[PDB]
Amino acid sequence: GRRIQGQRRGRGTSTFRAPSHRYKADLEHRKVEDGDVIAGTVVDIEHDPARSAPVAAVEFEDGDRRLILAPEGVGVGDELQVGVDAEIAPGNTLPLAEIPEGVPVCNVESSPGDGGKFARASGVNAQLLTHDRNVAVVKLPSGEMKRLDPQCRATIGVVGGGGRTDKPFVKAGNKHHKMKARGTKWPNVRGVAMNAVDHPFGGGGRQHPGKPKSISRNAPPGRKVGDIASKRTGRGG
RNA sequence: GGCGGGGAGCCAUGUGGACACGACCCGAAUCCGGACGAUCUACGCAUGGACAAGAUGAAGCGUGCCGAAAGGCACGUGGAAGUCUGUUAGAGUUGGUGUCCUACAAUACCCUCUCGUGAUCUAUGUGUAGGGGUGAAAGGCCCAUCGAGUCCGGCAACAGCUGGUUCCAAUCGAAACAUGUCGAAGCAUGACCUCCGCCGAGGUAGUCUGUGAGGUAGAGCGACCGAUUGGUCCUGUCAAACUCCAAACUUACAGACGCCGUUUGACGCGGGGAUUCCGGUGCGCGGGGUAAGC
RNA sequence: GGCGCCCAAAAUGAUCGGGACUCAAAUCCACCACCGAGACCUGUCCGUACCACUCAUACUGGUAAUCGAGUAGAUUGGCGCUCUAAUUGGAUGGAAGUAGGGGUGAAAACUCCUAUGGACCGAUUAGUGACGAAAAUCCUGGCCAUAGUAGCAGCGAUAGUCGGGUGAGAACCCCGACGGCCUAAUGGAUAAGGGUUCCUCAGCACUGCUGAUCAGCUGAGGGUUAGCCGGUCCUAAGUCAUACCGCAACUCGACUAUGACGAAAUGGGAAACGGGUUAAUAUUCCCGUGCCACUAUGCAGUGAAAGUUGACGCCCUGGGGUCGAUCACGCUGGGCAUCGCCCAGUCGAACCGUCCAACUCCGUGGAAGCCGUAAUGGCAGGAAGCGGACGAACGGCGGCAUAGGGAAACGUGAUUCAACCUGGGGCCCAUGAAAAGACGAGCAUAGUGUCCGUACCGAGAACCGACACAGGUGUCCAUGGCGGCGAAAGCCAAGGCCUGUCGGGAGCAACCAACGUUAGGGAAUUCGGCAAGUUAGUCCCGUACCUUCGGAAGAAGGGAUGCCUGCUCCGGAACGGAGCAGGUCGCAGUGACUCGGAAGCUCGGACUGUCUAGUAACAACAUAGGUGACCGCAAAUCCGCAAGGACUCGUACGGUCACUGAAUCCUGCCCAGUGCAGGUAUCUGAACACCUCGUACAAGAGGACGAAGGACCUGUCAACGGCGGGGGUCUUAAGGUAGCGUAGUACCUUGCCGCAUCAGUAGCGGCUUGCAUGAAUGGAUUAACCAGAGCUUCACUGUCCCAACGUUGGGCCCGGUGAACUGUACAUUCCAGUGCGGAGUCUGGAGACACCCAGGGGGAAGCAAAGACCCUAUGGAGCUUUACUGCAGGCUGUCGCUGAGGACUCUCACUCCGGGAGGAGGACACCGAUAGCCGGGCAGUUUGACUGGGGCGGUACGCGCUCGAAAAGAUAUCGAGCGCGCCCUAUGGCUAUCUCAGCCGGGGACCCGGCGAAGAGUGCAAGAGCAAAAGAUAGCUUGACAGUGUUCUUCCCAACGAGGAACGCUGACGCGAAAGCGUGGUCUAGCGAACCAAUUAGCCUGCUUGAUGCGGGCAAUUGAUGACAGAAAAGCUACCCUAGGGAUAACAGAGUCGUCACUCGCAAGAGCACAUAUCGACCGAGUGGCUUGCUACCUCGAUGUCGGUUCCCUCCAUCCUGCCCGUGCAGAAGCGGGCAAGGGUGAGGUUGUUCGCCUAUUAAAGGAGGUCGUGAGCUGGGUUUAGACCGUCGUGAGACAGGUCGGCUGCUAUCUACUGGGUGUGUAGGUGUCUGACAAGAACGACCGUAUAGUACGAGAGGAACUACGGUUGGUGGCCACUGGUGUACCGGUUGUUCGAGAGAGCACGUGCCG
Ligand SMILES: [Cl-]
Ligand SMILES: [Cl-]
Ligand SMILES: [Cl-]
Ligand SMILES: [K+]
Ligand SMILES: [Mg+2]
Ligand SMILES: [Mg+2]
Ligand SMILES: [Mg+2]
Ligand SMILES: [Mg+2]
Ligand SMILES: [Mg+2]
Ligand SMILES: [Mg+2]
Ligand SMILES: [Mg+2]
Ligand SMILES: [Mg+2]
Ligand SMILES: [Mg+2]
Ligand SMILES: [Mg+2]
Ligand SMILES: [Mg+2]
Ligand SMILES: [Mg+2]
Ligand SMILES: [Mg+2]
Ligand SMILES: [Mg+2]
Ligand SMILES: [Mg+2]
Ligand SMILES: [Mg+2]
Ligand SMILES: [Mg+2]
Ligand SMILES: [Mg+2]
Ligand SMILES: [Mg+2]
Ligand SMILES: [Mg+2]
Ligand SMILES: [Mg+2]
Ligand SMILES: [Mg+2]
Ligand SMILES: [Mg+2]
Ligand SMILES: [Mg+2]
Ligand SMILES: [Mg+2]
Ligand SMILES: [Mg+2]
Ligand SMILES: [Mg+2]
Ligand SMILES: [Mg+2]
Ligand SMILES: [Mg+2]
Ligand SMILES: [Mg+2]
Ligand SMILES: [Mg+2]
Ligand SMILES: [Mg+2]
Ligand SMILES: [Mg+2]
Ligand SMILES: [Mg+2]
Ligand SMILES: [Mg+2]
Ligand SMILES: [Mg+2]
Ligand code: NA
Ligand code: NA
Ligand code: NA
Ligand code: NA
Ligand code: NA
Ligand code: NA
Ligand code: NA
Ligand code: NA
Ligand code: NA
Ligand SMILES: [Sr+2]
Ligand SMILES: [Sr+2]
Ligand SMILES: [Sr+2]
Ligand SMILES: [Sr+2]
Ligand SMILES: [Sr+2]
Ligand SMILES: [Sr+2]
Ligand SMILES: [Sr+2]
Ligand SMILES: [Sr+2]
Ligand SMILES: [Sr+2]
Ligand SMILES: [Sr+2]
Ligand SMILES: [Sr+2]
Ligand SMILES: [Sr+2]
Ligand SMILES: [Sr+2]
Ligand SMILES: [Sr+2]
Ligand SMILES: [Sr+2]
Ligand SMILES: [Sr+2]
Ligand SMILES: [Sr+2]
Ligand SMILES: [Sr+2]
Ligand SMILES: [Sr+2]
Ligand SMILES: [Sr+2]
Ligand SMILES: [Sr+2]
Ligand SMILES: [Sr+2]
Ligand SMILES: [Sr+2]
Ligand SMILES: [Sr+2]
Ligand SMILES: [Sr+2]
Ligand SMILES: [Sr+2]
Ligand SMILES: [Sr+2]
Ligand SMILES: [Sr+2]
Ligand SMILES: [Sr+2]
Ligand SMILES: [Sr+2]
Ligand SMILES: [Sr+2]
Ligand SMILES: [Sr+2]
Ligand SMILES: [Sr+2]
Ligand SMILES: [Sr+2]
Ligand SMILES: [Sr+2]
Ligand SMILES: [Sr+2]
Ligand SMILES: [Sr+2]
Ligand SMILES: [Sr+2]
Ligand SMILES: [Sr+2]
Ligand SMILES: [Sr+2]
Ligand SMILES: [Sr+2]
Ligand SMILES: [Sr+2]
Ligand SMILES: [Sr+2]
Ligand SMILES: [Sr+2]
Ligand SMILES: [Sr+2]
Ligand SMILES: [Sr+2]
Structure with missing residues (x-):
C-alpha cells in the first residue's frame, strides 16, 4: 500500500x-x-x-x-522574583524546596535547570505535596504523583487562561484558525473512509474497520493505528 | 543375468538436424537501475492583492413607563453573522443530456444555475519527489501521462498467443490418432509420411478349403435369471447389464489359385528428416438427447 | 389393388432452375433411336521409372493394361542477383540502364531489333553471400480518386456605403462624408513571458481563411541616453557553500557553527518636478526649477545615545481633506436657430516657507449630576469652562511664476468628497514579519555620484496553448455624463475600432441553428412540465403550520405606482429623503431595461464548507458536538542506513491514535471465538555460560536453568462482532430492550385498509408476522439550510391536440481560396434461392438508355478504435488475508562496552541535567552482535486440470467388474449398474476324512433314512472357476521363504516407469506312501519416482603416511507425493491492463420444437330429454416458428441493449365493418360456425416497462412478421463501467441473476436505394393535339339520427328490417369569399438615452415594449 x-x-x-x-x-x-x-x-x-x-x-x-x-x-x-530567597507569592520562582507544602505551582522543571517542563498549559497546575532532603512529591495535572528533585524550580500559582476549554468551537472555521497556529494537519479523514491502499481500516463496500481496533504495541509504524495497546475500551464495565 | 570381445579410426570441406545464446522477422501488458520533473496540479509556508450596492438587525448602550428589588415592556441606538439578495470584482458549474464533436478549442460557446467577509478568492516567491509526496478521501493530483510520473538504460525481456517468411521443376506423400505430461491453443514417445544404408527370397490387399476363436442380429425361456396376464392343466407377455439355441460376419494359422518380389531387391532390419496429435461428411452399426446443420 | 381428392394457416414478389405442359413435356409398364466428360479407344509429343548399349546421369533403341491429381512434410535437378579468382570475350564504328517490339525455354529465365542513353559490360569454371516479395492495420518516398467537395456563416462585437487618392492591378492600402461597433473594455499604464516583433525607405516569390499597392511578411538602414524610475542595498518563507559528523563511497545525508544567497508589477527603501524636442527615447536628451548622499574646505558644535522611526491583523465609524463630478454667477471660444437653450475652456508642479484638527500632556478652575458622542463613554484618583506645551495631510495659504502652457479668457463661491491625513469603538481557544536604513544631530561653498535595465507587444495577431487558436494569462486606472440602491441594465462622452478580416447573387425553396407570434383547449405531452413560460423593482396593508424562539417570512393574500400645477415636513444643505391638494393621458406608468412564480407532504444529510482537472456535486468527504485509546516529556506517535529529525519557542485545559457526526430523547443483553491488556503456583518456552556422555581435540547426543511468548486465569464491546432454531432449553457467550418498520433495508409485492384521481405498480397515512430493522457497525427524531431523491395543488404556457406564419445566420447559384475521412477488385439493381446457416458480385427470373443537380439517410451485417463483456494463457498489475515463503520493525534473553566491594552496596567507564561548580543515574541504559516471540508494515510468489462457455455442483483425476461395445482385438461421453485404497497367523499352506443349499419321511435344536451337478460355500463389487474340491471338518505346518531370471501385462496393434501375473533355474523347507502340492487368500481391485532418513548383512573407500573419530559407496527394506508417471502454494479487482479466440458465453441470426401458440381425429361426459345449439376429459395426429429451452453453425482486427417514438411494407390463426349457416333462432339481443385481409382498430391513470391492472369513450378499440423492422432517425426512463448508501454474505480485499441516488450517445454519403429536378443520345425539319402498353390509389372507410314505426314479432315487457333522407367521424385532394393565425410591409401609442428644446430621428438583437 x-x-x-x-x-x-x-x-x-x-x-x-x-x-x-x-x-x-x-x-x-x-x-x-x-x-x-x-x-x-x-x-x-x-x-x-x-x-x-x-x-x-x-x-x-x-x-x-x-x-x-x-x-x-x-x-x-x-514585581516578580526568581531565586531561593524569593518571597512566596504568586508569580515567583523558587526551588520546590523553598515552596511550602500545599501550594499550587506551575512550569515545573523535570531536572534542575531545564527551565520548566510540567504544567504549562492553560489553567492547569501541579500541587506540591511532600517535602524532604531527597525528594519533593508533586501532583501533576494528570493526577499522577510525581517524584522530583527538590532542587527543581517552579512558579507559584496556576497557569493563566483557565477555562479556555469551557467554550465550544461551534464552527469548523474557528477550529481552523487555531489549528493554523499549531504543528497539526487538520481536518481529519477517518481511515475507515479511505481506500484499502491508504490505511488499515480502508476499503470495504461499507465503512467499518476490517479488524479489531486494538493494536499491539509492538505493531510496526504503518500498522499501529486505532486503539493503541488499549488496556480496555468502551465505557461499560 | 548386465555390459564388453575375431583391428577402424583421426582430421578436413560441404550439407541435414539438436542445445545455449536475440537464434527466421515483427508483434504487449511487465519487472529492475540511474536520472529529470511541484512552469500543471495537491497541500503547507513567506510577502502582496481583491470583494458595487442593498437586506436582515445579535450583544452592548440609551430613554421612557412599571417595579421594593430582581428585573420587565416600548421605542431608539448599535452593527454582529463560516447571515441573506446580488452576472460589483472574483470563484464555480445544476440543467439544456442545447451549439460544437475532421471543433475556435486533444475539455470550447450560449442561456439557466451556485458562491460572493470567509474553512473566501488570488499573484509571486518558497517547500514536499516516485512505492515516495500531496489528498476535507474521488485511487483524486504530482506539466494532455497515475491502482505507482517522465526520460534513458537493463533490452534485441519472455510468450506454448496473432501476423508475416521473397525463384522454377522432378520423385514420394501424410497426421487430425495412442501412451505420458500443472496436460488439454504446448510438448515428448509411438502410429503414419520421406530419405539413406544393410539384408537376400520370399510376400499376402482378394477368394476357396482345412484346423481353431467368438455369443452380435434373430430367436427362445415346462433351459437359467428377473420381469410380466387371467381362469377352474390351460391362457397373455418381455430383457443393454438372461441364454437350452444361434447366424450373416469378424478373426488366428496353414495349403491352393491369384497378384507381387528376386537388374524396379519385395518381406525385414538399422539410421537421418519431418509434418502431425482443433478435423469434417456420406453410408453401416451405434450410445445419450423430444430433437438438432446436437 | 392403382392414381387422385379432403385433412393442408405466415409474414417485400407465386413457382418444377424458368418458359410452360393435360391421349402430357405427368405417373406407371415395356420398347426404339439418339445427345452427352479430361472416363474408355486411337495418332504424335513430354516427363518419370525400368531395360539394352555406354565412361555417361551424353546419344540411340526398347518396355509401362499393371506410370502420370495432391495440403503439411521428406528427397533431387535447375533459373536469377552481389563481389573474388582462374580461363576467355564485348564496348565511343556506342557499354550498362530504360521504353516499345521480334525469337527461344514447360518454367525460373535467356536473347535479338528499334529508340533513348553516353561509359562501362559479360561468359565458362571454382568460390562468396546483408541473393529473389503481392501480402506482415509491414517501412520510407512518391501519386490518384475523394473534390473544385467540407471550411472561409453561427459567439450579444450582424458593418459598412458613396465619392476620391496611389497604383500595371484596388470590396477589403490611404483621405473625406454618411452609417456603425467597444465603456472594468475593443480605451490608458504596466508584471511575467517574447526578443527587435519598434521607426524609416524600398518591395510582394514566402506568411496572411479571398485580394493586396497593405502588414507582426521580404530587403536595407536606423532606434533604447538617468545621482534623484527600477536594479543595485535589507532582511521573509526558504536555498546553497565551507566546517563538523555520517556513509563502503559520492555529485548523497540531518543537526550545529560561519558566510553567502533569497522580494524589478506586489515587503522595507536617501533624492525630481513642469515644460519642450524626435520618424523611433525621454522624471534619462534640452530648458527652467528643485532635491539627496558622500567627500573637501570654512564657520558653528561638543553634544551622540537614550529614545523615536522603519513596523504592520480583521470588522464598524467620526473628523480634516484634494482630484473628480455637479450647482450658482462672470469671462473666452464654439454650436443651433420658431424657442433660448446646448457644448468646451477658464490652467499652472516638485520644491521652499508657513497654518493645524485629532491624540497626549500642563496650569487654572472646582462639578457630589453635570460634560460629551454617530456609538462607546468621562469625572473629587478633579468634569465643563479658560489659558498653555507638544502636534497632520499626496491638504490650505505665499513663494516657485514679467517659469511654463493657451487662439482666447487666463474665474469666484458652494455641495458631495477617491487619494492622502488624524481619531473613536468592537473581535481573537486566531494576536496579525524581519533587517538594512532614517530621525535624534546646524549652515556655506565646491567636487563626486560609477555599473546594469530602459525599443515594442502585453493580447479574439507580438505571452502559453504545434496557428495571426472564440481557450488560458497577474496589476492599477472602481469617481466621465444620463440612469438607478448600485462598480447593475440600457443609452452616450474622452479614447479606440470597422481586423472577434473573404466576397457577390436569388422575397432568398426543402432542411438545420438561434429567435418572434400563434385561435380554442391547458400538462392531454414526457420516465419526469425536460424545454419554454409564469412571477418580478418599490411603498402600504396583511401573513399559517411548525420552531432549537434565532427563524419560518419577501410565507400566502390584497392594494398602490406616470405626467403636470402648487405645496408641507425632516435636514445646514444636496443637483438628498418622506408626504399633501388639484389637474390630466394611455390598452398598459418597476410602460424599455432591470426585476422571486407560490403552497403542502415524504426521504437524506444538521448547517457554511469538500470532491472525481476531462461523463458522478450526491445521500459521499469535512465539520462543531459525543466517545474510546496512548503518554509525565530521557514520554506517547512518527521520519532516517547512519549522523540525526517532525511533533516542539509544545507539556495532560497538552497532542498523538482512532470511531461517531449539530441540537433534543436515548444508547439494552453478550467477554464463548478473535483482538488488546493485566496476572500467573504449575506446564511449556531459544541462545550464551554450566554439567554429563562422546571425541587425546572438534563435530554430535543429553541435562540443568528458564526471558518475553504460549497453556491457564482475569479485565474490556462508544474493540472486532453477535442478539437464532426448537419447546412450555440447544448452539456458540447472549437471544433483540427503547424505538423504528413493506424502509434508499420487505423476496413474496402492484402486501391489506384508507386518502387523492374518471381511472394512481406512484405519493402519503395506518396496519406490519421485520425473506434478511435496531441503538456511537449508533437508534429515534428534528426547526433551519439544500443546483440532493419522490409526490400533490394553484397559477402559466405551442410540452401536447396540430400545426402555421414570420426574423437573423447558413443552406442554393457565382468569383477566389481549398483540405480530410475512405479506397482488394469489379459494381444500374430488384425478388427469391443457394452458400460457413445474415449475397450489388453465386443460381433462376425480373428490371435496367447514359450523365448531372438537390434531398432525407433504407442497405453496403456503412466509417471510426487488433471487443473494454465472456473464455483461454503454467500472461501483467493494484488490493486482501489466520495462502506459501521471506524482509523490516517492536518486545525479550545473552555476549562485548564493563569497573570495585539469587540478592545487595559502590564509583571509575558510559548516559542525562547544569553556563559553571556541580547535580541525577550507573555498570544498567545507549550502541555493536546474537537468540526466542509478535510481525500483510513491506517484498516475491502461488492459488492445477476435467467441464455441451465459465462459476457453483461433481470427478467420469489412480484402480477393479457387468453393460454400453456392433459374436477376434481395440473403442468415447458429466454413459447405465457398482465397487477398491483393506481385512485375515488363519480367513495361509499340506494331508486325512467328507459333501453342500433346499425338500420329504421317522423320533425351525440334535438323531436316522431318502431325493438332491451345485440353487451352498469359497472375507469384500461384479462377472467368472470349483464337488472323491478350489467347499466342510480334523490334524499338522509356516512356501505370506531367500537368490536370480524368462514371458506377458501395465502400454491390443506400437515406444514408455512403478505396480501385477503366469512360468523357470538355484537354495532351504512343510505336508504326503508317493506322484505331488505350497513363489499367500480360486481369478480379475487393495497402489507410489528421484533426493534424504532409519533399518539389514557383508564388503569398497576418504587427497604424503599410520592410528582413532566422523564421513562417502555397492544391494535391499521402511517412511509419500489420492492432482495417484510425484511443485512446498489462498483470494478480490466494476480501477483495471496485454495477448488471442467466434477454438467459448452475453444480443441477433441459423438448426431443433420438449416448451409455447394454433389445428385436426376419436367423443367419454353434460347440456331437464337429447354427444354434436353449446361445453367438452382421456388418448391420438399435426401445422406454425410468436414464447421458452437446447445446440454452439456465423460474427470477438465490434452486427450498439430493453421500452418508447417516428415512418414504410406485410401475414391471417378475423376484434369491427360486408355476405352467409346453425341455434337451447318469436322479436330485440345473444351464442357458435363459414367466406372474407378493402378499410379500421383510437384517448387516458400507476409502472422504464414489454406485459398487465384500471377509467371513460367506441362499429371494434384483434394478434403477429419485417436483424424480438426502425440509435451513420430520435429518446435514454430500464439494463450494464468508473462515485455512494442499505440489506444479506465474507476475517478481509470484496461480492450479490437484491434495492437505491448520480453518471457520455462520434462521422463533411464514395457506391447502392428511393423522393423530386435537369442535360444528352436513340426512335429520325417543326408546331399543335392525342393515343395508352403498362404504373399508383382507400379515395374512400365507418357511425349516429329521422321517416319506415311504437309498426312486423310478442300475453306483456320489449321491439326490428327493405328503402328514402339529414348529419358526424377518420382518411384523401384542393382552395382563401367567410372565421381564425401570422404578417421584424405599414400606421399609431409609449419607457430610457443621445442628437440643446421643438420638429424629426438613432440605439435598447436581429421589432425597446405595446396596440
Ligand atoms: Cl484544539
Ligand atoms: Cl530444369
Ligand atoms: Cl469619534
Ligand atoms: K463479435
Ligand atoms: Mg473536543
Ligand atoms: Mg473525520
Ligand atoms: Mg472511498
Ligand atoms: Mg472505489
Ligand atoms: Mg493496508
Ligand atoms: Mg458511517
Ligand atoms: Mg462504521
Ligand atoms: Mg436599528
Ligand atoms: Mg518448387
Ligand atoms: Mg525436372
Ligand atoms: Mg434381441
Ligand atoms: Mg573458361
Ligand atoms: Mg526488393
Ligand atoms: Mg461529395
Ligand atoms: Mg513611446
Ligand atoms: Mg485572428
Ligand atoms: Mg402517455
Ligand atoms: Mg427645514
Ligand atoms: Mg420512498
Ligand atoms: Mg450537506
Ligand atoms: Mg468530472
Ligand atoms: Mg470530533
Ligand atoms: Mg451498544
Ligand atoms: Mg498477479
Ligand atoms: Mg503482498
Ligand atoms: Mg519473477
Ligand atoms: Mg470386442
Ligand atoms: Mg524406517
Ligand atoms: Mg498423471
Ligand atoms: Mg462457434
Ligand atoms: Mg478474432
Ligand atoms: Mg380464414
Ligand atoms: Mg430490435
Ligand atoms: Mg439503423
Ligand atoms: Mg448513434
Ligand atoms: Mg451522423
Ligand atoms: Na502364393
Ligand atoms: Na479583409
Ligand atoms: Na452616476
Ligand atoms: Na467475547
Ligand atoms: Na493494477
Ligand atoms: Na424500439
Ligand atoms: Na380486412
Ligand atoms: Na398504460
Ligand atoms: Na441488430
Ligand atoms: Sr535551555
Ligand atoms: Sr524548553
Ligand atoms: Sr474497511
Ligand atoms: Sr455497557
Ligand atoms: Sr508554484
Ligand atoms: Sr455569506
Ligand atoms: Sr447530464
Ligand atoms: Sr435553450
Ligand atoms: Sr465535447
Ligand atoms: Sr449570493
Ligand atoms: Sr529497451
Ligand atoms: Sr466386430
Ligand atoms: Sr505429374
Ligand atoms: Sr505428382
Ligand atoms: Sr501418386
Ligand atoms: Sr534480403
Ligand atoms: Sr489531392
Ligand atoms: Sr460575415
Ligand atoms: Sr459556431
Ligand atoms: Sr502579383
Ligand atoms: Sr508596425
Ligand atoms: Sr540580495
Ligand atoms: Sr518595491
Ligand atoms: Sr467627510
Ligand atoms: Sr516605454
Ligand atoms: Sr483573451
Ligand atoms: Sr468617441
Ligand atoms: Sr485578409
Ligand atoms: Sr403582431
Ligand atoms: Sr403531467
Ligand atoms: Sr400523464
Ligand atoms: Sr403583489
Ligand atoms: Sr446527536
Ligand atoms: Sr476475550
Ligand atoms: Sr446530405
Ligand atoms: Sr493362486
Ligand atoms: Sr473466502
Ligand atoms: Sr463500485
Ligand atoms: Sr385464408
Ligand atoms: Sr361481423
Ligand atoms: Sr407485470
Ligand atoms: Sr440511461
Ligand atoms: Sr445504340
Ligand atoms: Sr330508426
Ligand atoms: Sr314501451
Ligand atoms: Sr433595431
Missing part, C-alpha cells in the same frame, strides 16, 4: 510543522547565579500564539527583558 498519514508526519514537511517563525519565546525559567537577589517588573501582557494563553513580559534589574510563563493574577507593574 501507501504510507499512512501518521508516517507522512515524521518526515517533518511544511504541512506538518508548527509555525515556529511565528512563535514568540520558550518560557524557560531565567537562570540565577545564586543567593536569589533577582527581581523584575512586569512591563506588559501578551498573547502566546503557541499556547493560546497569555504570557508576561518582565524587565529584570540587570536589564534583561524576557517573556515569562505567566500564572493567573500577574498584572503590569507587579
